[PDB]
Amino acid sequence: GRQFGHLTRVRHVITYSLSPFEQRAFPHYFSKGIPNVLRRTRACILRVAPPFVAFYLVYTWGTQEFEKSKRKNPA
């Protein structure tokens, strides 16, 4: 296991933090969040959606081919 003060060497990086009591928990929750969430979705839809569509259509065809098979039409 590792602890602070032994992790790695870092030089020249200032970090400015604020107390939680001085700031608001939801700065711009809907005015920034919604722009972000669509942006996040658009970033991944072409990478996550296409196999699920491909599954869905195999599922819907497969089940439709299941029932429309055991019933006859001639003698």
Partner 1 sequence: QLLDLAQKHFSGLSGTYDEDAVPTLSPCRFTGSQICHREDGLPLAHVAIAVEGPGWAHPDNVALQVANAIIGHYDCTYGG
Ligand X SMILES: CCCCCCCCCCCCCCCCCC(=O)OC[C@H](COP(=O)([O-])OCC(O)COP(=O)([O-])OC[C@@H](COC(=O)CCCCCCCCCCCCCCCCC)OC(=O)CCCCCCCCCCCCCCCCC)OC(=O)CCCCCCCCCCCCCCCCC
Chain contacts with partner 1 (rule: CB under 8 A): 9-19, 21-22
Q: Which of 32, 38, 41, 61 binds ligand X (CB under 6 A)?
A: 32
**Which whole-number Å values give the CA distances from 46 to 14, 30, 41, in the listed order?**
38, 25, 9
Q: Which of 3, 15, 36, 73 binds ligand X (CB under 6 A)?
A: 36
Task: Give least dist CB 61 to ligand X, A.
Answer: 32
Neighbours of 52 (CB within 10 A): 9
Chain residues 1-30 in contact with ligand X, contact rule CB under 6 A: 30
CA–CA separation, 14 and 10 (whole Å)? 11
CA–CA separation, 18 and 21 (whole Å)? 8
Q: Which is nearer to ligand X, 21 or 30 (CB)?
A: 30
Q: Does 38 bind ligand X (CB under 6 A)?
A: no
